[PDB]
Amino acid sequence: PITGLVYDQRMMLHHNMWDSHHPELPQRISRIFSRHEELRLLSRCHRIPARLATEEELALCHSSKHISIIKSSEHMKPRDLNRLGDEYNSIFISNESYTCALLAAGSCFNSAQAILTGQVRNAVAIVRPPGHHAEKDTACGFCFFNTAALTARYAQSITRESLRVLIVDWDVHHGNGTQHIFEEDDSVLYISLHRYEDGAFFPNSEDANYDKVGLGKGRGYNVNIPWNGGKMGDPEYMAAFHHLVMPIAREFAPELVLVSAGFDAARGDPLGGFQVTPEGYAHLTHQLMSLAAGRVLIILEGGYNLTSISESMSMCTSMLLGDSPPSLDTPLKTSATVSINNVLRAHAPFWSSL
């Protein structure tokens, strides 16, 4: 009954040399780690070591051109770094970014391996830069390589190709890269909850709407839960889990659960505009541990209020360690019920539990 934790201070080296107060801060991960220390959660976990992902592992999801150009940024001059970052949507790059992205991915591989070999029951990965916006062939939205997508494919590579991986993405933004990587795949069920606002919210694409249910063999294996017109919080997320996430996940019967766990839907986030509480994230975590025989890996994505993400992620780890869920605090916003209803209608053909 062991919970793994991976954290390495080397991932703070990735930094924004033109805007040192950019919200994707090095101290995002040191703050979460520190909160684990001062809550005495760290000593209750088995520390899993970080490692660099290999280029061969990156190729599980990414093109050689993309891998090579990000790789080359390690030796780039400042002007090269500025111009390259400006080729992408919302990217900054420093000479340490490539290594930090490799460490984030390899940290999650070691954690998935420890779960799948039975050395830990579940695990938490306190990593940066994030991953879920990264596409096969491009960087995007503070993300270089798609850590969660790579971990899913790594998990299949050390078990069997068809290993059923559920990815729950509760970052407030749609994981466009993760959706696209698995859009034709029925072995990786992608479920995202996200602020959508009829396509106006970052990453600003109608790919995030509820009618994108997957393509080809993957039809039914892509579940978008888009929020419109409301400061969503614990009632809405709990409702979406009761009506959609958990029924669908149970029917899928994952053998491994990855959480793309951004904490930018948290109360206090400067960007998300939502009000999920730490106790809400604890309840979402507690529900997911009823799947996959408890084999859950929580991977840090976004989240920009250092206090909010530290409280929120620490509460998730508390839940992985087996602590009892804390009590919650409001009527469902009607527009949330509309969203849940749209998804139900779109996915009832694919999931008899709906």
Binding test (CB under 6 A) with ligand QHO, winner from 141, 226, 235, 280: 141
Q: Which two tokens stand for residue 215?
A: 């393509």
Judged by CB under 5 A, the stretch of 46-54, 149-157, 170-178, 195-203 that binds K ion is 170-178
171 labelled binding-site residue:
yes
Distance in angstroms between the alpha carbons of the first and the last residue of the chain: 33
8 labelled binding-site residue:
no
| Contact between 92 and ligand QHO per CB under 6 A | no
Nearest to 83 by CA among 14, 18, 128: 18
According to DSSP, residue 171 is labeled S
Binding test (CB under 6 A) with ligand QHO, winner from 226, 264, 282, 318: 264
- Angle in degrees, 0-180, between the axes of helices 97-116 and 147-158, rounded to the nearest 10: 40
The secondary structure of 326-354 as a DSSP string is PPP--PPPHHHHHHHHHHHHHHTTT-TT-
Binding test (CB under 5 A) with Zn ion, winner from 4, 106, 230, 262: 262
Q: Which residue is catalytic, options 133, 174, 194, 283?
A: 133
Q: Is 133 labeled as catalytic in the residue annotation?
A: yes
| Contact between 135 and ligand QHO per CB under 6 A | no
Nearest to 181 by CA among 124, 125, 210, 140: 140
Nearest to 241 by CA among 295, 203, 284: 284
- Among residue numbers 233 through 262, which ones bind ligand QHO (CB under 6 A)? 262
Distance CA 119, CA 275 (A): 35
CB of 347 to K ion, least distance (A): 12
Distance CA 352, CA 215 (A): 19
| Contact between 227 and K ion per CB under 5 A | no
| Contact between 35 and ligand QHO per CB under 6 A | no
Question: What residues are designated binding site?
Answer: 171, 173, 264
Residues that bind K ion (CB under 5 A): 169, 171, 182, 185, 190, 192, 194, 218, 221-222
Question: What residues are designated binding site for Zn(2+)?
Answer: 171, 173, 264
Q: Which residues are catalytically annotated?
A: 133
